[PDB]
Write a protein that binds this ligand. Structure first.
Ligand SMILES: *[C@H]1O[C@H](COP(=O)(O)OP(=O)(O)OC[C@H]2O[C@@H](n3cnc4c(N)ncnc43)[C@H](O)[C@@H]2O)[C@@H](O)[C@@H]1Cl
Ligand SMILES: [K+]
Length: 255
């Protein structure tokens, strides 16, 4: 009966895009220069080619995880939930801190779609499974759960997280951040999780650190024996300007 999936198909020129991103990343990051980008592509394709794209497992991605092993300075991590573009803008100006997309494997996959099919060795450019409409264990969703659990496990000292203060659930306990990332923060390594709650422009300077879902996050973090801190980012434009030039007279010292 199944004639196609509900989601968009594999990114056009996905193979070229993965290989090119690997070459660019290993140029910019001489600490990953040991990587063989063709081997990385072959491991990536091997995770999902010739497999039914609702049957993918974390073990499928183990060859890729091995080749893309990277040590990230554990006290320099910025996590995010539903506000990736501002998190990226932040690490473009605070260049010693890392989101997952600043790691080799996150950089390879960012904003892409991919899948295969059981019958053949071909990449499916026509359609790929949507996580909700078709199946959760799809090539893209399984990749991100695999790599983000390792990223969260590795974080230490003070960990920061950006949250979207415009959403109905500023912290959604069932989001990928709330499931995979929060519950892989290890208390033996992590002292504090500090949330940066980004105002949208319709929160009227309310203190969103008192929001019910932030109180939920505080309780979950407290139960993992980690300290919780929360800061409102009232003006995300001015915040980035001040990260770039900390002496600009528009700067606050709220963060
Ligand atoms: C750990 O959690 C972060 C994302 O958490 P979230 O709360 O924003 O997730 P969600 O909205 O519940 O699910 C989003 C879904 O998107 C996939 N995904 C993650 N990162 C990317 C990038 N960079 N590009 C495209 N798709 C992405 C993933 O399957 C999520 O489940 C996040 O930093 C890691 Cl996953
Ligand atoms: K701790």
């Amino acid at each position: 009966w199944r004639q196609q999936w509900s989601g968009p198909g594999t990114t056009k020129r996905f193979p070229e895009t993965v290989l090119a991103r690997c070459v660019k990343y290993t140029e910019i990051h001489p600490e990953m220069r040991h990587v063989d980008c063709q081997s990385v592509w072959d491991a990536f394709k091997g995770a999902f080619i010739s497999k039914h794209p609702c049957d993918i497992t974390e073990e499928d991605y183990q060859p890729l995880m091995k080749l893309g092993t990277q040590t990230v300075p554990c006290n320099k991590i910025l996590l995010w939930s539903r506000i990736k573009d501002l998190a990226h803008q932040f690490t473009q100006v605070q260049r010693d801190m890392f989101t997952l997309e600043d790691t080799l494997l996150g950089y390879l996959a960012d904003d892409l779609t991919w899948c295969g099919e059981f019958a053949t060795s071909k990449i499916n450019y026509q359609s790929c499974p949507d996580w909700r409409k078709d199946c959760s264990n799809n090539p893209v969703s399984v990749f991100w759960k695999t790599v983000s659990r390792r990223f969260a496990e590795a974080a230490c000292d003070v960990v920061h997280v950006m949250l979207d203060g415009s959403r109905s659930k500023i912290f959604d306990k069932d989001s990928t951040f709330g499931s995979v990332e929060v519950h892989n923060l290890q208390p033996e390594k992590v002292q504090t999780l500090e949330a940066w709650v980004i105002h949208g422009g319709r929160e009227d300077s309310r203190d969103l650190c008192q929001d019910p879902t932030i109180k939920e996050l505080e309780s979950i973090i407290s139960k993992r024996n980690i300290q919780f801190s929360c800061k409102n980012i009232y003006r995300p434009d001015k915040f980035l300007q001040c990260v770039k030039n900390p002496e600009d007279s528009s700067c606050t010292s709220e963060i």
